[PDB]
Amino acid sequence: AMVVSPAGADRRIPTWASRVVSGLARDRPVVVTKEDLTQRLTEAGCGRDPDSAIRELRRIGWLVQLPVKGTWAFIPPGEAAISDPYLPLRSWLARDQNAGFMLAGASAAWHLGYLDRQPDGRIPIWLPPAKRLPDGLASYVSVVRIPWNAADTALLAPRPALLVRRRLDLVAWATGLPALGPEALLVQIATRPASFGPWADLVPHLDDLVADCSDERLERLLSGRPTSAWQRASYLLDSGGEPARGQALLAKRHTEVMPVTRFTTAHSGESVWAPEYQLVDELVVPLLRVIGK
Ligand code: NA
C-alpha cells in the first residue's frame, strides 16, 4: 500500500541537496529514475557522484528504492509516506514504456467495482507470453499468463462505452494503469480459478460482473482456451443470473465433446452439479453458502 520514508516526516535537507530536493518538490515526478536524478544534480551545480548522492538521499529519507533497477520514489516535503499501491508497476513503466502488463484478477475486479474490500498482497497482472517480468518485481506482483494476442489490447481493456455507463474515468479508473475489462477478468478467472484470490469477495457480485460483459467479447477471449474455461465461463453467466446467455456461450465452443470439469481453486466443503455445463461447482455456490450462514 505505502512507501514510507525511513526518516519520518521531518527530514533534514543538507545544503548540497537543497536545489535537488526543491526541484523534485516542485515537479513531483511519479518515479525518479537514476538519469533524472543525475541531471538534477548537474543542474543544481552539484558535482557529487550520482550513486553517492542517491545513497545519502536514501539514508536521510528523501528517496526510497523501488523494485526496478534505477528507480526511486521521492517522498515529498511534509509527508511521511506515499499511498500508491502500484508504485512497483509505475517503476517498471519508468524504465520500459512498453512493459506491456495489465492489472488483472483482484486489482481489475476492485476498480471495476466487483469487490467488497480493497485487495492487498502482490499485485495481480497479466503479461503476454513474450514478456519477461523484471526479477526485482517477483516479490511485488503475481503474473497470470493466458496466451491472449498482445496486439489486441482493445479486446482486453474494458469497452470505453462501458466505462462511461459505469461512471468510470476513461483513463484513470484503474489509477492510470492498463487493466483488464470485465470480459477479460471473467475469462481469466474461469480459465484459471486459482489465479484469483478473493473469490468470497467476488461471488456476491457476479450479477454485476455478468451484466457488464458483452458475449461477443467473451467468445473472442475464450477462443483457444481449453473447453473447461468455456464451461466455467458459461456457468459464471448462469450464476450471475443469465442462464440463457451461459448456454448460448457454451454452444459456441470449438470442441464438441465436453468432459466433466470442476470449478475449484484446489479440489478436495460441498459441491453442486450443473449438467448444462458438465460442471461440478466446488467454489461459487459453496462460497455463497458459507457467506449466507
Ligand atoms: Na455491472
PDB file of C-alpha atoms and ligand atoms in Angstrom:
ATOM      1  CA  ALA A   1       0.000   0.000   0.000  1.00  0.00           C
ATOM      2  CA  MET A   2       2.568   2.588   1.085  1.00  0.00           C
ATOM      3  CA  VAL A   3       6.156   3.607   0.523  1.00  0.00           C
ATOM      4  CA  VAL A   4       7.473   5.059   3.816  1.00  0.00           C
ATOM      5  CA  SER A   5      10.394   7.381   4.476  1.00  0.00           C
ATOM      6  CA  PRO A   6      12.715   5.678   6.984  1.00  0.00           C
ATOM      7  CA  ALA A   7      13.392   9.172   8.363  1.00  0.00           C
ATOM      8  CA  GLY A   8       9.812  10.039   9.267  1.00  0.00           C
ATOM      9  CA  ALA A   9       8.087  13.220   8.060  1.00  0.00           C
ATOM     10  CA  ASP A  10      10.608  15.686   9.432  1.00  0.00           C
ATOM     11  CA  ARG A  11      13.688  15.271   7.190  1.00  0.00           C
ATOM     12  CA  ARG A  12      16.864  17.325   7.117  1.00  0.00           C
ATOM     13  CA  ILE A  13      17.950  18.762   3.805  1.00  0.00           C
ATOM     14  CA  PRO A  14      21.707  19.107   3.515  1.00  0.00           C
ATOM     15  CA  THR A  15      22.639  22.298   1.674  1.00  0.00           C
ATOM     16  CA  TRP A  16      24.291  20.391  -1.213  1.00  0.00           C
ATOM     17  CA  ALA A  17      20.895  18.772  -1.886  1.00  0.00           C
ATOM     18  CA  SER A  18      18.710  21.876  -1.401  1.00  0.00           C
ATOM     19  CA  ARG A  19      18.062  22.590  -5.101  1.00  0.00           C
ATOM     20  CA  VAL A  20      17.737  18.883  -5.903  1.00  0.00           C
ATOM     21  CA  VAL A  21      15.076  18.368  -3.248  1.00  0.00           C
ATOM     22  CA  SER A  22      13.354  21.695  -4.081  1.00  0.00           C
ATOM     23  CA  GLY A  23      13.215  20.749  -7.756  1.00  0.00           C
ATOM     24  CA  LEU A  24      11.694  17.332  -7.008  1.00  0.00           C
ATOM     25  CA  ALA A  25       9.294  19.049  -4.556  1.00  0.00           C
ATOM     26  CA  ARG A  26       8.182  21.453  -7.355  1.00  0.00           C
ATOM     27  CA  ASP A  27       7.970  18.829 -10.112  1.00  0.00           C
ATOM     28  CA  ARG A  28       6.690  15.799  -8.156  1.00  0.00           C
ATOM     29  CA  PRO A  29       7.617  13.085 -10.685  1.00  0.00           C
ATOM     30  CA  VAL A  30       5.718   9.793 -10.143  1.00  0.00           C
ATOM     31  CA  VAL A  31       9.004   7.881 -10.196  1.00  0.00           C
ATOM     32  CA  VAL A  32      12.571   9.232 -10.098  1.00  0.00           C
ATOM     33  CA  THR A  33      14.990   7.496 -12.474  1.00  0.00           C
ATOM     34  CA  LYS A  34      18.739   7.493 -11.898  1.00  0.00           C
ATOM     35  CA  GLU A  35      19.077   9.604 -15.070  1.00  0.00           C
ATOM     36  CA  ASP A  36      16.559  12.156 -13.790  1.00  0.00           C
ATOM     37  CA  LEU A  37      18.432  12.471 -10.505  1.00  0.00           C
ATOM     38  CA  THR A  38      21.817  12.703 -12.317  1.00  0.00           C
ATOM     39  CA  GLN A  39      20.550  15.600 -14.463  1.00  0.00           C
ATOM     40  CA  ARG A  40      19.045  17.370 -11.425  1.00  0.00           C
ATOM     41  CA  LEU A  41      22.365  17.114  -9.561  1.00  0.00           C
ATOM     42  CA  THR A  42      24.199  18.734 -12.509  1.00  0.00           C
ATOM     43  CA  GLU A  43      21.544  21.457 -12.782  1.00  0.00           C
ATOM     44  CA  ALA A  44      21.979  22.247  -9.062  1.00  0.00           C
ATOM     45  CA  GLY A  45      25.727  22.824  -9.600  1.00  0.00           C
ATOM     46  CA  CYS A  46      26.242  19.710  -7.505  1.00  0.00           C
ATOM     47  CA  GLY A  47      29.305  17.736  -8.554  1.00  0.00           C
ATOM     48  CA  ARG A  48      28.524  14.715  -6.362  1.00  0.00           C
ATOM     49  CA  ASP A  49      28.771  11.232  -7.801  1.00  0.00           C
ATOM     50  CA  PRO A  50      25.121  10.320  -8.619  1.00  0.00           C
ATOM     51  CA  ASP A  51      25.344   6.953  -6.799  1.00  0.00           C
ATOM     52  CA  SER A  52      26.785   8.681  -3.732  1.00  0.00           C
ATOM     53  CA  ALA A  53      24.111  11.410  -3.860  1.00  0.00           C
ATOM     54  CA  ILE A  54      21.364   8.781  -4.077  1.00  0.00           C
ATOM     55  CA  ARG A  55      22.819   6.716  -1.198  1.00  0.00           C
ATOM     56  CA  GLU A  56      22.780   9.764   1.065  1.00  0.00           C
ATOM     57  CA  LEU A  57      19.337  10.877  -0.102  1.00  0.00           C
ATOM     58  CA  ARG A  58      18.173   7.310   0.624  1.00  0.00           C
ATOM     59  CA  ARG A  59      19.820   7.337   4.041  1.00  0.00           C
ATOM     60  CA  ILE A  60      18.220  10.609   5.018  1.00  0.00           C
ATOM     61  CA  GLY A  61      14.827   9.534   3.666  1.00  0.00           C
ATOM     62  CA  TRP A  62      14.049  11.570   0.558  1.00  0.00           C
ATOM     63  CA  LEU A  63      14.402   8.726  -1.974  1.00  0.00           C
ATOM     64  CA  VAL A  64      13.131   5.176  -1.382  1.00  0.00           C
ATOM     65  CA  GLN A  65      14.421   2.470  -3.697  1.00  0.00           C
ATOM     66  CA  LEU A  66      11.801   0.906  -5.957  1.00  0.00           C
ATOM     67  CA  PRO A  67      11.821  -2.750  -7.214  1.00  0.00           C
ATOM     68  CA  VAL A  68      13.004  -1.933 -10.715  1.00  0.00           C
ATOM     69  CA  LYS A  69      16.712  -1.130 -11.085  1.00  0.00           C
ATOM     70  CA  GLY A  70      17.459   2.566 -11.452  1.00  0.00           C
ATOM     71  CA  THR A  71      14.185   3.865  -9.972  1.00  0.00           C
ATOM     72  CA  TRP A  72      13.256   5.565  -6.689  1.00  0.00           C
ATOM     73  CA  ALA A  73      10.237   7.181  -5.131  1.00  0.00           C
ATOM     74  CA  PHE A  74      10.568  10.778  -3.918  1.00  0.00           C
ATOM     75  CA  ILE A  75       8.796  11.309  -0.609  1.00  0.00           C
ATOM     76  CA  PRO A  76       7.610  14.922  -0.786  1.00  0.00           C
ATOM     77  CA  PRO A  77       8.204  17.529   1.914  1.00  0.00           C
ATOM     78  CA  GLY A  78       5.664  17.323   4.729  1.00  0.00           C
ATOM     79  CA  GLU A  79       4.780  13.675   4.099  1.00  0.00           C
ATOM     80  CA  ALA A  80       5.923  10.559   5.881  1.00  0.00           C
ATOM     81  CA  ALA A  81       4.840   8.198   3.066  1.00  0.00           C
ATOM     82  CA  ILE A  82       3.265   7.752  -0.329  1.00  0.00           C
ATOM     83  CA  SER A  83      -0.067   5.962  -0.600  1.00  0.00           C
ATOM     84  CA  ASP A  84       0.049   4.310  -4.020  1.00  0.00           C
ATOM     85  CA  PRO A  85      -0.090   0.530  -4.226  1.00  0.00           C
ATOM     86  CA  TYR A  86       1.093   0.404  -7.828  1.00  0.00           C
ATOM     87  CA  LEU A  87       4.470   2.089  -7.485  1.00  0.00           C
ATOM     88  CA  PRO A  88       6.298  -1.171  -8.338  1.00  0.00           C
ATOM     89  CA  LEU A  89       4.478  -1.211 -11.709  1.00  0.00           C
ATOM     90  CA  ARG A  90       4.933   2.504 -12.325  1.00  0.00           C
ATOM     91  CA  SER A  91       8.655   1.967 -11.655  1.00  0.00           C
ATOM     92  CA  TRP A  92       8.650  -0.617 -14.432  1.00  0.00           C
ATOM     93  CA  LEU A  93       6.954   1.807 -16.888  1.00  0.00           C
ATOM     94  CA  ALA A  94       9.569   4.398 -15.867  1.00  0.00           C
ATOM     95  CA  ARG A  95      12.286   2.133 -17.301  1.00  0.00           C
ATOM     96  CA  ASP A  96      10.221   0.486 -20.069  1.00  0.00           C
ATOM     97  CA  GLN A  97       7.220   2.330 -21.519  1.00  0.00           C
ATOM     98  CA  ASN A  98       6.427  -0.944 -23.383  1.00  0.00           C
ATOM     99  CA  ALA A  99       6.290  -3.120 -20.235  1.00  0.00           C
ATOM    100  CA  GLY A 100       3.030  -4.467 -21.667  1.00  0.00           C
ATOM    101  CA  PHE A 101       1.317  -5.545 -18.430  1.00  0.00           C
ATOM    102  CA  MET A 102      -2.266  -5.063 -17.460  1.00  0.00           C
ATOM    103  CA  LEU A 103      -3.731  -5.078 -13.951  1.00  0.00           C
ATOM    104  CA  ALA A 104      -5.620  -8.381 -13.649  1.00  0.00           C
ATOM    105  CA  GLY A 105      -7.553 -10.595 -11.245  1.00  0.00           C
ATOM    106  CA  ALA A 106      -8.382  -8.883  -7.945  1.00  0.00           C
ATOM    107  CA  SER A 107      -6.986  -5.474  -8.952  1.00  0.00           C
ATOM    108  CA  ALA A 108      -9.057  -5.308 -12.125  1.00  0.00           C
ATOM    109  CA  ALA A 109     -12.140  -6.567 -10.206  1.00  0.00           C
ATOM    110  CA  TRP A 110     -11.592  -3.962  -7.483  1.00  0.00           C
ATOM    111  CA  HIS A 111     -11.503  -0.959  -9.805  1.00  0.00           C
ATOM    112  CA  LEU A 112     -14.360  -2.339 -11.960  1.00  0.00           C
ATOM    113  CA  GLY A 113     -16.347  -2.452  -8.709  1.00  0.00           C
ATOM    114  CA  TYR A 114     -16.910  -6.166  -8.112  1.00  0.00           C
ATOM    115  CA  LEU A 115     -15.222  -6.456  -4.701  1.00  0.00           C
ATOM    116  CA  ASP A 116     -16.372  -5.563  -1.205  1.00  0.00           C
ATOM    117  CA  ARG A 117     -12.834  -4.958   0.069  1.00  0.00           C
ATOM    118  CA  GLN A 118      -9.710  -3.468  -1.397  1.00  0.00           C
ATOM    119  CA  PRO A 119      -7.412  -6.362  -2.094  1.00  0.00           C
ATOM    120  CA  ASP A 120      -3.929  -6.431  -0.635  1.00  0.00           C
ATOM    121  CA  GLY A 121      -0.853  -8.539  -1.326  1.00  0.00           C
ATOM    122  CA  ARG A 122       1.096  -8.930  -4.517  1.00  0.00           C
ATOM    123  CA  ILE A 123      -0.352  -7.012  -7.472  1.00  0.00           C
ATOM    124  CA  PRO A 124      -2.042  -9.354  -9.945  1.00  0.00           C
ATOM    125  CA  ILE A 125      -1.120  -8.594 -13.557  1.00  0.00           C
ATOM    126  CA  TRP A 126      -1.450 -10.211 -16.949  1.00  0.00           C
ATOM    127  CA  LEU A 127       1.603 -10.319 -19.220  1.00  0.00           C
ATOM    128  CA  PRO A 128       1.764 -11.533 -22.812  1.00  0.00           C
ATOM    129  CA  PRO A 129       3.718 -14.815 -23.417  1.00  0.00           C
ATOM    130  CA  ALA A 130       6.676 -12.961 -24.908  1.00  0.00           C
ATOM    131  CA  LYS A 131       7.274 -10.503 -21.995  1.00  0.00           C
ATOM    132  CA  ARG A 132       9.578 -11.253 -19.054  1.00  0.00           C
ATOM    133  CA  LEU A 133       8.956  -9.892 -15.587  1.00  0.00           C
ATOM    134  CA  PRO A 134      11.980  -7.980 -14.257  1.00  0.00           C
ATOM    135  CA  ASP A 135      13.466 -10.066 -11.400  1.00  0.00           C
ATOM    136  CA  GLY A 136      13.162  -7.287  -8.808  1.00  0.00           C
ATOM    137  CA  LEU A 137       9.375  -7.384  -9.277  1.00  0.00           C
ATOM    138  CA  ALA A 138       8.618 -11.040  -8.407  1.00  0.00           C
ATOM    139  CA  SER A 139       8.029 -10.221  -4.692  1.00  0.00           C
ATOM    140  CA  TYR A 140       5.551  -7.481  -5.644  1.00  0.00           C
ATOM    141  CA  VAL A 141       3.474  -8.904  -8.492  1.00  0.00           C
ATOM    142  CA  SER A 142       1.772 -12.193  -9.389  1.00  0.00           C
ATOM    143  CA  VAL A 143       1.576 -12.916 -13.106  1.00  0.00           C
ATOM    144  CA  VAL A 144      -1.262 -14.672 -14.912  1.00  0.00           C
ATOM    145  CA  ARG A 145      -0.185 -15.965 -18.280  1.00  0.00           C
ATOM    146  CA  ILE A 146      -3.133 -16.664 -20.584  1.00  0.00           C
ATOM    147  CA  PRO A 147      -1.830 -16.515 -24.172  1.00  0.00           C
ATOM    148  CA  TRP A 148      -4.092 -13.754 -25.431  1.00  0.00           C
ATOM    149  CA  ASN A 149      -2.948 -11.783 -28.516  1.00  0.00           C
ATOM    150  CA  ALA A 150      -0.894  -8.898 -27.071  1.00  0.00           C
ATOM    151  CA  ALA A 151      -1.770  -6.951 -30.238  1.00  0.00           C
ATOM    152  CA  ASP A 152      -5.474  -6.805 -29.410  1.00  0.00           C
ATOM    153  CA  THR A 153      -5.476  -4.810 -26.129  1.00  0.00           C
ATOM    154  CA  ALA A 154      -8.810  -3.267 -27.207  1.00  0.00           C
ATOM    155  CA  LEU A 155     -10.207  -6.717 -26.565  1.00  0.00           C
ATOM    156  CA  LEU A 156      -8.542  -6.966 -23.121  1.00  0.00           C
ATOM    157  CA  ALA A 157      -9.319  -3.477 -21.864  1.00  0.00           C
ATOM    158  CA  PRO A 158     -12.876  -2.545 -20.862  1.00  0.00           C
ATOM    159  CA  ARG A 159     -15.024  -1.061 -23.583  1.00  0.00           C
ATOM    160  CA  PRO A 160     -14.850   2.737 -23.316  1.00  0.00           C
ATOM    161  CA  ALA A 161     -18.677   2.844 -23.609  1.00  0.00           C
ATOM    162  CA  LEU A 162     -18.872   0.552 -20.578  1.00  0.00           C
ATOM    163  CA  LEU A 163     -16.596   2.890 -18.558  1.00  0.00           C
ATOM    164  CA  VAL A 164     -18.890   5.832 -19.433  1.00  0.00           C
ATOM    165  CA  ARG A 165     -22.067   3.925 -18.454  1.00  0.00           C
ATOM    166  CA  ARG A 166     -20.349   2.834 -15.226  1.00  0.00           C
ATOM    167  CA  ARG A 167     -19.242   6.415 -14.363  1.00  0.00           C
ATOM    168  CA  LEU A 168     -15.595   5.334 -14.541  1.00  0.00           C
ATOM    169  CA  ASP A 169     -12.962   7.709 -15.810  1.00  0.00           C
ATOM    170  CA  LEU A 170     -11.945   6.736 -19.350  1.00  0.00           C
ATOM    171  CA  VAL A 171      -8.273   6.935 -18.419  1.00  0.00           C
ATOM    172  CA  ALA A 172      -7.907   6.925 -14.612  1.00  0.00           C
ATOM    173  CA  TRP A 173     -10.424   4.293 -13.455  1.00  0.00           C
ATOM    174  CA  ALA A 174      -7.502   1.927 -12.508  1.00  0.00           C
ATOM    175  CA  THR A 175      -5.356   4.886 -11.303  1.00  0.00           C
ATOM    176  CA  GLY A 176      -3.847   5.379 -14.733  1.00  0.00           C
ATOM    177  CA  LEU A 177      -2.512   1.889 -15.431  1.00  0.00           C
ATOM    178  CA  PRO A 178      -3.806  -0.508 -18.133  1.00  0.00           C
ATOM    179  CA  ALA A 179      -6.288  -3.001 -16.651  1.00  0.00           C
ATOM    180  CA  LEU A 180      -8.391  -5.922 -17.835  1.00  0.00           C
ATOM    181  CA  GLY A 181     -12.031  -5.235 -18.518  1.00  0.00           C
ATOM    182  CA  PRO A 182     -14.869  -7.397 -17.184  1.00  0.00           C
ATOM    183  CA  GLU A 183     -14.767  -9.818 -20.110  1.00  0.00           C
ATOM    184  CA  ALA A 184     -11.052 -10.485 -19.757  1.00  0.00           C
ATOM    185  CA  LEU A 185     -11.451 -10.702 -15.992  1.00  0.00           C
ATOM    186  CA  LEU A 186     -14.254 -13.243 -16.281  1.00  0.00           C
ATOM    187  CA  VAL A 187     -12.309 -15.304 -18.816  1.00  0.00           C
ATOM    188  CA  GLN A 188      -9.211 -15.136 -16.616  1.00  0.00           C
ATOM    189  CA  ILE A 189     -10.921 -16.460 -13.522  1.00  0.00           C
ATOM    190  CA  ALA A 190     -12.872 -19.142 -15.496  1.00  0.00           C
ATOM    191  CA  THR A 191      -9.682 -20.280 -17.265  1.00  0.00           C
ATOM    192  CA  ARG A 192      -7.552 -20.366 -14.120  1.00  0.00           C
ATOM    193  CA  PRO A 193      -9.674 -20.014 -10.969  1.00  0.00           C
ATOM    194  CA  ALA A 194      -6.530 -20.472  -8.806  1.00  0.00           C
ATOM    195  CA  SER A 195      -5.077 -17.269 -10.273  1.00  0.00           C
ATOM    196  CA  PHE A 196      -7.762 -15.285  -8.468  1.00  0.00           C
ATOM    197  CA  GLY A 197      -7.648 -14.813  -4.684  1.00  0.00           C
ATOM    198  CA  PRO A 198     -10.711 -13.138  -3.129  1.00  0.00           C
ATOM    199  CA  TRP A 199     -13.460 -15.428  -4.504  1.00  0.00           C
ATOM    200  CA  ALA A 200     -15.668 -14.911  -1.428  1.00  0.00           C
ATOM    201  CA  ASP A 201     -15.365 -11.153  -2.008  1.00  0.00           C
ATOM    202  CA  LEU A 202     -16.306 -11.531  -5.691  1.00  0.00           C
ATOM    203  CA  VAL A 203     -19.088 -14.130  -5.716  1.00  0.00           C
ATOM    204  CA  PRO A 204     -21.838 -11.911  -4.219  1.00  0.00           C
ATOM    205  CA  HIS A 205     -21.289  -9.528  -7.174  1.00  0.00           C
ATOM    206  CA  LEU A 206     -21.380 -11.943 -10.132  1.00  0.00           C
ATOM    207  CA  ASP A 207     -24.685 -10.423 -11.299  1.00  0.00           C
ATOM    208  CA  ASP A 208     -22.930  -7.039 -11.513  1.00  0.00           C
ATOM    209  CA  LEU A 209     -19.970  -8.517 -13.455  1.00  0.00           C
ATOM    210  CA  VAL A 210     -22.082 -10.534 -15.881  1.00  0.00           C
ATOM    211  CA  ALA A 211     -24.309  -7.558 -16.756  1.00  0.00           C
ATOM    212  CA  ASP A 212     -21.107  -5.728 -17.877  1.00  0.00           C
ATOM    213  CA  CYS A 213     -19.835  -8.421 -20.262  1.00  0.00           C
ATOM    214  CA  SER A 214     -20.525  -8.497 -23.954  1.00  0.00           C
ATOM    215  CA  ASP A 215     -20.909 -12.119 -25.057  1.00  0.00           C
ATOM    216  CA  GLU A 216     -19.069 -11.466 -28.348  1.00  0.00           C
ATOM    217  CA  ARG A 217     -16.018 -10.249 -26.405  1.00  0.00           C
ATOM    218  CA  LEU A 218     -16.296 -13.224 -24.051  1.00  0.00           C
ATOM    219  CA  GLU A 219     -16.316 -15.555 -27.001  1.00  0.00           C
ATOM    220  CA  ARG A 220     -13.267 -13.983 -28.674  1.00  0.00           C
ATOM    221  CA  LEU A 221     -11.344 -14.022 -25.371  1.00  0.00           C
ATOM    222  CA  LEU A 222     -12.274 -17.712 -24.817  1.00  0.00           C
ATOM    223  CA  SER A 223     -11.159 -18.645 -28.321  1.00  0.00           C
ATOM    224  CA  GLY A 224      -8.225 -21.028 -27.852  1.00  0.00           C
ATOM    225  CA  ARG A 225      -8.811 -21.606 -24.149  1.00  0.00           C
ATOM    226  CA  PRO A 226      -9.476 -25.204 -23.042  1.00  0.00           C
ATOM    227  CA  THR A 227     -13.101 -26.400 -23.087  1.00  0.00           C
ATOM    228  CA  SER A 228     -13.116 -26.254 -19.296  1.00  0.00           C
ATOM    229  CA  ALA A 229     -12.707 -22.448 -19.479  1.00  0.00           C
ATOM    230  CA  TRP A 230     -15.793 -22.232 -21.681  1.00  0.00           C
ATOM    231  CA  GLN A 231     -17.736 -24.430 -19.242  1.00  0.00           C
ATOM    232  CA  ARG A 232     -16.685 -22.341 -16.265  1.00  0.00           C
ATOM    233  CA  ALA A 233     -17.263 -19.005 -18.019  1.00  0.00           C
ATOM    234  CA  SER A 234     -20.706 -20.089 -19.123  1.00  0.00           C
ATOM    235  CA  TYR A 235     -21.520 -21.249 -15.594  1.00  0.00           C
ATOM    236  CA  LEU A 236     -20.449 -17.793 -14.293  1.00  0.00           C
ATOM    237  CA  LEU A 237     -23.004 -16.227 -16.660  1.00  0.00           C
ATOM    238  CA  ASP A 238     -25.605 -18.629 -15.247  1.00  0.00           C
ATOM    239  CA  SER A 239     -24.542 -17.806 -11.683  1.00  0.00           C
ATOM    240  CA  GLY A 240     -24.849 -14.062 -12.474  1.00  0.00           C
ATOM    241  CA  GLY A 241     -28.466 -14.716 -13.349  1.00  0.00           C
ATOM    242  CA  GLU A 242     -28.146 -15.235 -17.093  1.00  0.00           C
ATOM    243  CA  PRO A 243     -28.645 -18.973 -17.794  1.00  0.00           C
ATOM    244  CA  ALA A 244     -29.753 -18.397 -21.405  1.00  0.00           C
ATOM    245  CA  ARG A 245     -26.592 -16.361 -22.160  1.00  0.00           C
ATOM    246  CA  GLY A 246     -24.437 -19.025 -20.474  1.00  0.00           C
ATOM    247  CA  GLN A 247     -25.885 -21.876 -22.532  1.00  0.00           C
ATOM    248  CA  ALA A 248     -25.579 -19.857 -25.758  1.00  0.00           C
ATOM    249  CA  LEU A 249     -21.956 -19.006 -24.995  1.00  0.00           C
ATOM    250  CA  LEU A 250     -21.176 -22.625 -24.214  1.00  0.00           C
ATOM    251  CA  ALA A 251     -22.683 -23.689 -27.536  1.00  0.00           C
ATOM    252  CA  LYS A 252     -20.012 -21.616 -29.354  1.00  0.00           C
ATOM    253  CA  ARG A 253     -17.034 -23.629 -28.002  1.00  0.00           C
ATOM    254  CA  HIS A 254     -14.669 -25.177 -30.528  1.00  0.00           C
ATOM    255  CA  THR A 255     -14.674 -28.743 -29.174  1.00  0.00           C
ATOM    256  CA  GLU A 256     -17.912 -30.784 -29.163  1.00  0.00           C
ATOM    257  CA  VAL A 257     -17.110 -33.412 -26.517  1.00  0.00           C
ATOM    258  CA  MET A 258     -17.287 -31.989 -23.064  1.00  0.00           C
ATOM    259  CA  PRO A 259     -15.511 -33.856 -20.236  1.00  0.00           C
ATOM    260  CA  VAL A 260     -16.842 -33.098 -16.737  1.00  0.00           C
ATOM    261  CA  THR A 261     -14.961 -30.160 -15.212  1.00  0.00           C
ATOM    262  CA  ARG A 262     -14.533 -28.970 -11.626  1.00  0.00           C
ATOM    263  CA  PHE A 263     -14.896 -25.335 -10.640  1.00  0.00           C
ATOM    264  CA  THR A 264     -12.393 -25.224  -7.817  1.00  0.00           C
ATOM    265  CA  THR A 265      -9.244 -23.385  -6.675  1.00  0.00           C
ATOM    266  CA  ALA A 266      -7.927 -26.686  -5.295  1.00  0.00           C
ATOM    267  CA  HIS A 267     -10.024 -29.868  -5.354  1.00  0.00           C
ATOM    268  CA  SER A 268     -10.584 -31.767  -2.058  1.00  0.00           C
ATOM    269  CA  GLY A 269     -16.520 -28.497   1.571  1.00  0.00           C
ATOM    270  CA  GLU A 270     -19.569 -29.182  -0.617  1.00  0.00           C
ATOM    271  CA  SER A 271     -20.493 -29.204  -4.356  1.00  0.00           C
ATOM    272  CA  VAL A 272     -23.355 -28.612  -6.816  1.00  0.00           C
ATOM    273  CA  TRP A 273     -23.789 -30.372 -10.180  1.00  0.00           C
ATOM    274  CA  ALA A 274     -24.547 -28.266 -13.247  1.00  0.00           C
ATOM    275  CA  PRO A 275     -25.234 -30.714 -16.116  1.00  0.00           C
ATOM    276  CA  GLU A 276     -25.926 -27.813 -18.546  1.00  0.00           C
ATOM    277  CA  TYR A 277     -22.175 -27.033 -18.346  1.00  0.00           C
ATOM    278  CA  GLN A 278     -20.957 -30.505 -17.380  1.00  0.00           C
ATOM    279  CA  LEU A 279     -19.619 -28.834 -14.296  1.00  0.00           C
ATOM    280  CA  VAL A 280     -19.147 -29.755 -10.662  1.00  0.00           C
ATOM    281  CA  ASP A 281     -19.098 -26.472  -8.726  1.00  0.00           C
ATOM    282  CA  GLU A 282     -16.928 -26.703  -5.591  1.00  0.00           C
ATOM    283  CA  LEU A 283     -16.436 -22.974  -5.385  1.00  0.00           C
ATOM    284  CA  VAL A 284     -19.082 -20.460  -6.412  1.00  0.00           C
ATOM    285  CA  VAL A 285     -22.247 -21.872  -4.748  1.00  0.00           C
ATOM    286  CA  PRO A 286     -20.305 -23.409  -1.801  1.00  0.00           C
ATOM    287  CA  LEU A 287     -18.815 -19.945  -1.018  1.00  0.00           C
ATOM    288  CA  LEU A 288     -22.247 -18.316  -1.370  1.00  0.00           C
ATOM    289  CA  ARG A 289     -23.489 -20.922   1.118  1.00  0.00           C
ATOM    290  CA  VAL A 290     -20.787 -20.107   3.697  1.00  0.00           C
ATOM    291  CA  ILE A 291     -21.440 -16.357   3.209  1.00  0.00           C
ATOM    292  CA  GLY A 292     -25.207 -16.699   3.861  1.00  0.00           C
ATOM    293  CA  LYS A 293     -24.560 -18.592   7.132  1.00  0.00           C
TER     294      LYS A 293
HETATM  295 NA    NA B   1     -22.459  -4.080 -13.818  1.00  0.00          NA
END
